[PDB]
Amino acid sequence: MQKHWWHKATVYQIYPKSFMDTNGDGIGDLKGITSKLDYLQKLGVMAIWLSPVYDSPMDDNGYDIANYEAIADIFGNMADMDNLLTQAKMRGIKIIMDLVVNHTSDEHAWFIEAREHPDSSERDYYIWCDQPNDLESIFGGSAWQYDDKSDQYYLHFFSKKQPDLNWENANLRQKIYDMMNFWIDKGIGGFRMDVIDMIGKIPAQHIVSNGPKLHAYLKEMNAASFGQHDLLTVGETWGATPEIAKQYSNPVNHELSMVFQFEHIGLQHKPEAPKWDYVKELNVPALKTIFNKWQTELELGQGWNSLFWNNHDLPRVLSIWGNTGKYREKSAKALAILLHLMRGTPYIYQGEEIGMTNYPFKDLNELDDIESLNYAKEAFTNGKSMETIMDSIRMIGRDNARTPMQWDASQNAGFSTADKTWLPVNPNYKDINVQAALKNSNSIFYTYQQLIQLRKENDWLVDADFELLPTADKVFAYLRKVREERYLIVVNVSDQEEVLEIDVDKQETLISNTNESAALANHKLQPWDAFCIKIL
């Protein structure tokens, strides 16, 4: 197991439009991010996964790129970007850019030429057809959009303004590599690869993710760009299984460092049902099976896990799986303890470290996300009341993760000085904000800070194995072992008292949000009790 700088790293995901606004337009920008690097350094993260800040029409808020080498005017300019890289590096922080190459904006120059001149080479940069099959767009409707100018349908698994790139075109792939090397030379620390498991798509055969040439393309990409460097590459792979992740992350395959797997996220909705048909409560026994599987199947040297609870497309963890009332702070720490002490690279989504929650959206106008808006329009004429629709969106809507970062108790939680913010600031900012989190020595922030420091200083977080222990349904306990070291992690993922039928010899407490001694002696766990102790 060759160790790289990122094996001890914790990554922080920033959603640019909602992090920090510095010019009063109600939207976050690059200078905003740069001004908060001391805060992130204090937190201890070693890298930032920066969501798209490239030139874009914003149909999918940055994931529909019109120019891979230009900063969207709304975030600032290339000078601001360069300074961010510089200032971040000065503080031990690397920047991981969001690589979105499965598709581009329909306003990208390649597509404009493809449509304007169907004989051009860029025409083959996309996927066209005369007779469309029944493939569907992930944002609703057909994945094929009819273009009346050229008289053919172009593929788009996402919005109509996000035409898919043709990865069978070796020349297109090379263009992508040239663009990737453009960013590599600027000093980035890696790439977060957007739906990367779709580049092996074969539309005509209804093959989307995990296509036959997927890994060959990744090997080619690696060899043509990031491979020669020591960067962190993580792919967003919704169709990833432990076996597939081994192929992606085992160093011997020369592909990626790790990938985001969404099997645990699948528990947020009924099996074989739309994400909108959400599950009210976390099936802890189900989560235990999934986490244990990924921990066991990806043994050191054979692969590497990424660890996350939420992102810019998911409900904040406290709202979907934690507690947002009497045990908000405690459940937040519990969930933090539970995830970060497993083997892998953990990712913290902005606001997660202070325990932010979903937002109580009142109506559709207040929303912004095309996915939710498309869902609402369809659902309303298919048996769903507006109230039922708004209820699903308040729980699952991607906009819940996109409300402004809550810095303090001043106007707009200190996010901006503008009359209004692009997305509304959650009123709970009066109680939930960075300033208040930093002031309280035992706040959620310090739990994450401590977890981050434990990983940077102790090899066992990486070297130790993982063993799930038999416990009550809602109790998530496991031990990490290596050499003469044995670590016991116990987390009561429950709003109520649970049993703990174990006997151990505690020799050291690494971290705890409660009186771990009392729990061990009384053989019972208080709601959301969580701790890691070194045992004999």
Q: Which residues are catalytic?
A: 194, 236
CB 22 to Ca ion: min, Å: 6
According to DSSP H, which parts of 201-283 are helical? 214-224, 242-249
Residue closer to Ca ion (CB basis): 115 or 173: 115
CB 35 to Ca ion: min, Å: 12
Instruction: Say if CB 303 and CB 246 are below 8 A apart.
Output: yes
Residue closer to Ca ion (CB basis): 25 or 465: 25
**How would you classify the pairing of strands 232-236 and 190-193?**
parallel
- C-alpha 85: how far from its chain's center? 21
CB 29 to Ca ion: min, Å: 4
DSSP, residue by residue, 397-443: -GGGG-SPP---SSGGGGT-SSSS-SSPPPGGGGTS-HHHHHHSTTS
Which residue sits closest to Ca ion, CB atoms considered? 29
Residue closer to Ca ion (CB basis): 35 or 417: 417
Residue closer to Ca ion (CB basis): 30 or 184: 30
Residue closer to Ca ion (CB basis): 27 or 530: 27
Half-sphere exposure of 385 (CA within 13 A, CB side): 3
Residue closer to Ca ion (CB basis): 77 or 374: 77
Determine which helix (DSSP H) or strand (DSSP E) holds 333, and give its type and residue range.
helix 328-340
CB 24 to Ca ion: min, Å: 6
DSSP, residue by residue, 146-181: EETTTTEEEE-SS-TTSPBB-TT-HHHHHHHHHHHH
Residue closer to Ca ion (CB basis): 21 or 59: 21
Alpha-carbon distance 373 to 353, whole Å?
29
Alpha-carbon distance 218 to 525, whole Å?
46
CB 411 to Ca ion: min, Å: 8
Instruction: Say if CB 190 and CB 94 are below 8 A apart.
Output: yes
188's CB contacts (< 8 A; 6+ apart) are 85, 94, 95, 96, 97, 231
Alpha-carbon distance 233 to 251, whole Å?
12
Alpha-carbon distance 75 to 99, whole Å?
17
Cα→Cα distances 225→178, 210, 222, 245, Å = 8, 22, 5, 21
Alpha-carbon distance 10 to 33, whole Å?
18
> Helix, strand or coil for residue 27?
coil
Residue closer to Ca ion (CB basis): 420 or 439: 420
Alpha-carbon distance 318 to 329, whole Å?
9
**How would you classify the pairing of strands 128-129 and 152-155?**
antiparallel
> Helix, strand or coil for residue 50?
strand
CB 18 to Ca ion: min, Å: 11
Place of tokens 């659902």: 379
Helix axes 170-184, 214-224, angle to 10 degrees: 40
318's CB contacts (< 8 A; 6+ apart) are 324, 328, 331, 332, 335, 355, 356, 357
Half-sphere exposure of 458 (CA within 13 A, CB side): 21
Binding site for Ca ion (CB under 5 A): 21, 23, 25, 27, 29, 148, 151, 417
Residue closer to Ca ion (CB basis): 387 or 419: 419
Structure tokens at 236: 């967003």
Measured torsion, CA atoms of residues 515, 520, 526, 531, in degrees rounded to the nearest 10? 60
